[PDB]
Amino acid sequence: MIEIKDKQLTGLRFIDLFAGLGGFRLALESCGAECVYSNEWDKYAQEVYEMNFGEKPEGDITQVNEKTIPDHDILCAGFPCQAFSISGKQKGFEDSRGTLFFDIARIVREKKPKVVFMENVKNFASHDNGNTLEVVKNTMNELDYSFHAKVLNALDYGIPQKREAIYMICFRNDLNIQNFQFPKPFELNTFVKDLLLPDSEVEHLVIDRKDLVMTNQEIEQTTPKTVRLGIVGKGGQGERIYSTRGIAITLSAYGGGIFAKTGGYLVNGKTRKLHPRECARVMGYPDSYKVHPSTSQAYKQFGNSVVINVLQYIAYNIGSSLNFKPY
DNA sequence: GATAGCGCTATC
DNA sequence: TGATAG
DNA sequence: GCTATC
Ligand SMILES: Nc1ncnc2c1ncn2[C@@H]1O[C@H](CSCC[C@H](N)C(=O)O)[C@@H](O)[C@H]1O
Ligand SMILES: *OC[C@H]1O[C@@H](n2ccc(N)nc2=O)C[C@@H]1O
């Protein structure tokens, strides 16, 4: 992740809903905020959270009495996105994992925090003819908050990963916050090969499919895009090899394919998926972060996590706005 | 749970 | 008649 | 992401 000398969010307290690995925790904390509550019902995500924050999140948010949630300035929430993803059934709100946002709303209505910082997949912005995004928007205003949503790509904030996401920032009206802005993009100068480990430590990840099919020659220069080199199987998800000379694809939490969740990369002429540590780096996570012992769960967690760096930039702007108080 | 072929969508 | 990524 | 396999 990036370093932020002056911490705008100093003095402000936040909530880590749908905690997961604690992406919003790492993002916010760096800006000076204090986390006063986290929630996560998955046994394994719970584990890693405790391995890194010495704490265990509260289970099922759908059963927590909002009156229980601690008072706070910023409510962070990257609720479930398997229902609006371009890779699923897209039943959205008509899905068991499709609601959850109404729990976010249920909590704001009772806690009225200065800011609501949310996150979800890019498709969420167009899902159901933009009507489902409109519902989040209308819901928020009803509660008396402005609404700033926007889809960003990590390949624009120094992270070599084609990971897109919708980011929705909400300010309370009584605060008349009018100068909020999303972080400006900038040239990427880090690529997949720059985050890899010594092939010595990942020889167990190597795979050799006699049905491997190269479809393009290795590139010379690096690029802020994903360059495919080959295909295995029918080339479906998890069956596509990319160059470490370009950037990394989206890391998925439930993706299948032989190169399940991370995708395939041609490393030293060796075909293989990424190591958990590498996924961490790809998500802008510090090496000091301890990954879950179960790798399947680890890929799964980084799979549906958030990129630290982008959150940091956004958190910074949230403070710069909250901190602009002229007479 | 962990593994993997898949099979349909969105954007172009 | 195509092509790639989720 | 879904889902059948073990
Ligand atoms: N009812 C519920 N209560 C608590 N957590 C829930 C939940 N339903 C889904 N979740 C959790 O929602 C999370 C969405 S993933 C969000 C990622 C997270 N902000 C990060 O930085 O990693 C998952 O970890 C899932 O287990
Ligand atoms: O692109 C959808 C696919 O990737 C995972 N994911 C991607 C991007 C964001 N913002 N969140 C995610 O969880 C989920 C899905 O499996």
Looking at residue A80, its amino acid is P
Neighbours of A225 (CB within 10 A): 12
d(CA A207, CA A259): 9
Strands, DSSP E only, in chain A? 13-17, 34-38, 74-77, 115-120, 148-153, 164-171, 206-207, 213-214, 228-231, 240-242, 264-267, 270-272
Identify the H or E element spanning A319: helix A308-322
A197 burial type by CB count under 10 A (0-12 exposed, 13-18 middle, 19+ buried): middle
Lookup result for tokens 């933009």: A130
CA of A236 to C1' of D3 (A): 15
What are A58's strand-pairing partners?
A39
d(CA A291, CA A295): 8
Is the Cβ atom of A162 within 7 Å of strand C at any atom?
yes
The first and second tokens of residue A184, run together, are 């400006």
Catalytic residue among A35, A76, A81, A279: A81
d(CA A48, CA A299): 12
Looking at chain A, after which residues does the C atom sit over 2.5 Å from the next written N, breaking the chain?
none
Question: Residues enclosing ligand 2, CB less than 6 A?
Answer: A 81, 85, 87, 121, 163, 165, 250, 252-254, 304
Ligand 2 centroid distance, CA of A255 (Å): 10
Residues contacting A21, CB < 8 A, separation 6+ = A45, A48, A49, A52, A285, A289, A301, A302, A305
The first and second tokens of residue A192, run together, are 């997949």
CA of A303 to C1' of C6 (A): 12
Neighbours of A311 (CB within 10 A): 28
Domains of chain A and any CATH numbers: 1-186+285-327 (3.40.50.150), 187-284 (3.90.120.10)
A102 burial type by CB count under 10 A (0-12 exposed, 13-18 middle, 19+ buried): middle
Determined by X-ray
Question: Residues enclosing ligand 1, CB less than 6 A?
Answer: A 18, 20-21, 23-24, 39-42, 45, 60-62, 78, 80, 100, 304-306
The first and second tokens of residue A189, run together, are 């100068």
d(CA A74, CA A319): 10
| Ligand 2 atom nearest residue A119's Cα | 10
Q: Which nucleotides of C are covered by protein (CB under 7 A)?
A: 4-6
Report the 3 state secondary structure along A263-276: CEEEECCEEECCCH
d(CA A75, CA A25): 11
Resolution (A): 2.8
CA nearest A66: which of A112, A114, A18?
A112
Cross-sheet strand order for the sheet of A240-242: A206-207, A270-272, A264-267, A240-242, A228-231, A213-214
d(CA A17, CA A78): 7
Region at A153 (left for phi over 0; alpha for psi -120 to 50; beta for the rest) = beta
Any idea of the CA torsion for A44, A99, A39, A171, to the nearest 10 degrees? 140
CB distance A170 to A140 below 8 Å: yes
d(CA A320, CA A301): 31
